[PDB]
């Protein structure tokens, strides 16, 4: 169960004038922060969201995000004007890090334009992606001339980001290592043809996302189980569905088993 910090940003430019920049942070599966265009700050969503930072240290970071939001919009509007780019612009940034035992850490800063990867931060500078729409190289030229921004991104990713993750893990063990027991139930599925009929397995309300779901006739699991996506609940937890088509006869006296962290060894067994 990995806990990387993913700082996600959505910057939408409709016109040369209309602009909206919004963000959010995830410590693994959990959403830790919110960044609304309307607000002058990054909203802390959990009682441990500030990590082991002081209010002043947290204010220093708050300042970096205000200047960055302002500057990023100014810089995009300038690049559009310069590089002659049609104004419905969709820019996305994904940054953060994941810390591992032995003080080891890997960081990243990726930028996408119109849903496609254009550049990223690699060590000390900005590098374009393999499919570089050429204007990106002109952008890189300009961007890499700012040794202050490059020095500041290194500080944030190589220094402050691992510090923030380590602080958050220490602060929120209570909610991060928490477990919530799910609830499973049997349901009737639609017939894809005549004799054939698909069977559905429902599991909902488990907090730590890693889970294993499989259909079984006994001690041997049955191959043909097509599970859906692990869909989220607003109620913090997750929901999962699993479909299996049978020739009607291979449905009588059917069993099921679901393995999860919450259940104290004994797996939830569902029967007809």
């Amino acid at each position, epitope marked *: 169960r990995l806990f990387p910090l993913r700082c996600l940003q959505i910057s939408s430019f409709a016109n040369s004038s209309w602009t909206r920049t919004d963000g959010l942070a995830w410590l693994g599966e959990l959403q830790t922060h919110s960044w609304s265009n309307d607000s002058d700050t990054v909203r802390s969503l959990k009682p441990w969201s500030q990590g082991t930072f002081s209010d002043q240290q947290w204010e220093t970071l708050q300042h970096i995000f205000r200047v960055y939001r302002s500057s990023f919009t100014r810089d995009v509007k300038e690049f559009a004007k310069m590089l002659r780019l049609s104004y419905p612009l969709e820019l996305q940034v994904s940054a953060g890090c994941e810390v591992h035992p032995g003080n080891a850490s890997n960081n990243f800063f990726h930028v996408a334009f119109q849903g496609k990867d254009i550049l990223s931060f690699q060590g000390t500078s900005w590098e374009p992606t393999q499919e570089a729409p050429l204007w990106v190289n002109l952008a890189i030229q300009v961007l890499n001339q700012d040794k202050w921004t490059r*020095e500041t991104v290194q500080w944030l990713l190589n220094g402050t980001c691992p510090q923030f993750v380590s602080g958050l893990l220490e602060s929120g063990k209570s909610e991060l290592k928490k477990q919530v027991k799910p609830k499973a139930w049997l349901s009737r599925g639609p017939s894809p043809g005549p004799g054939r009929l698909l069977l559905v397995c429902h599991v909902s309300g488990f907090y730590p996302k890693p889970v294993w779901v499989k259909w079984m006739r006994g001690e041997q699991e049955q191959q043909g189980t097509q599970p859906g996506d692990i869909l989220p609940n607003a109620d913090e937890t997750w929901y999962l569905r699993a479909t299996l088509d049978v020739v009607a006869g291979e449905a009588a006296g059917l069993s099921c088993r679901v393995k999860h962290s919450s259940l104290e060894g004994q797996d939830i067994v569902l029967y007809w």
Partner: T-cell receptor, first 116, second 115 residues
Framework: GTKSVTRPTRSSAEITCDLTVINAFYIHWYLHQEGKAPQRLLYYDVSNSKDVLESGLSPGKYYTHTPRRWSWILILRNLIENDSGVYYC????????????????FGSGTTLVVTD | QKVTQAQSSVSMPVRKAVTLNCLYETSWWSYYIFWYKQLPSKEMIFLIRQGSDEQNAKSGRYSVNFKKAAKSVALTISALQLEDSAKYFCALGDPGGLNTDKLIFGKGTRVTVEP
């Protein structure tokens, strides 16, 4: 060169900033008392005209006045003996040697002497 | 956040070198150290900046010997001049890369350049 401002207790002093900052964002005020380490008391956010005070300092005590552009004045109310010292204003500049990084540039300093 | 400069006074002859020791405490994984020079006129002059993730800094006759593990930033003035006699302050940034940041200073060391 360093100035001096002599004032009686229970009165107020005006420490004028020695720096000329063309694109000022933040003006920091430091107090250096003989034998102690220089410490910043507050900084003034030029854009939002706001004083940000260090923890432990009472609001009202310090106020950065800006009578005009590129001019800053630190006003101290209710002077006492412990207010005496050398007062500097500062900015992150990059600079006389012109570097990629900012270094903190300090004014000449104003020596506050609180008599009685 | 704390900065200590154990040396109150130091005397060294002209043309020789002097190592001004400093020990700090920081609540930042990545920070910057700055060395300042105070003249008898109370004027504060910036000499050199260090920085945790950087190599040992050198700017003219100023050189920083940065031992990150022990948290030491010993400044060395190599070919002393008479004009070098002043109060040298060691400042730790909080963190020292943003225009809102503060500097945490040591109490200062006074160098007395012997003619």
């Amino acid at each position: 060169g360093t100035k001096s401002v002599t004032r009686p207790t229970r009165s107020s002093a005006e420490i004028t900033c020695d720096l000329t900052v063309i694109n000022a964002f933040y003006i920091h005020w430091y107090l250096h008392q003989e034998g102690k380490a220089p410490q910043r008391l507050l900084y003034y956010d030029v854009s939002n005209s706001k004083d940000v005070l260090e923890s432990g300092l009472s609001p009202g005590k310090y106020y950065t006045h800006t009578p005009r552009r590129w001019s800053w004045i630190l006003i101290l109310r209710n002077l006492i003996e412990n207010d005496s010292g050398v007062y500097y204003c500062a900015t992150w500049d990059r600079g006389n040697p012109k570097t990629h990084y900012y270094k903190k540039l300090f004014g000449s300093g104003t020596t506050l002497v609180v008599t009685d | 956040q704390k900065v200590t400069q154990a040396q109150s006074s130091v005397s060294m002859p002209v043309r020789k070198a002097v190592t001004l020791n400093c020990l700090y405490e920081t609540s930042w994984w990545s920070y910057y150290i700055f060395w300042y020079k105070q003249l008898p006129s109370k004027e504060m002059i910036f000499l050199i900046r260090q920085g945790s993730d950087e190599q040992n800094a050198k700017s003219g006759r100023y050189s920083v010997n940065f031992k990150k593990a022990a948290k030491s930033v010993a400044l060395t003035i190599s070919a002393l001049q008479l004009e070098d006699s002043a109060k040298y302050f060691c400042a730790l940034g909080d963190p020292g890369g943003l225009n809102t940041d503060k500097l945490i200073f040591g109490k200062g060391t006074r160098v007395t350049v012997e003619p």
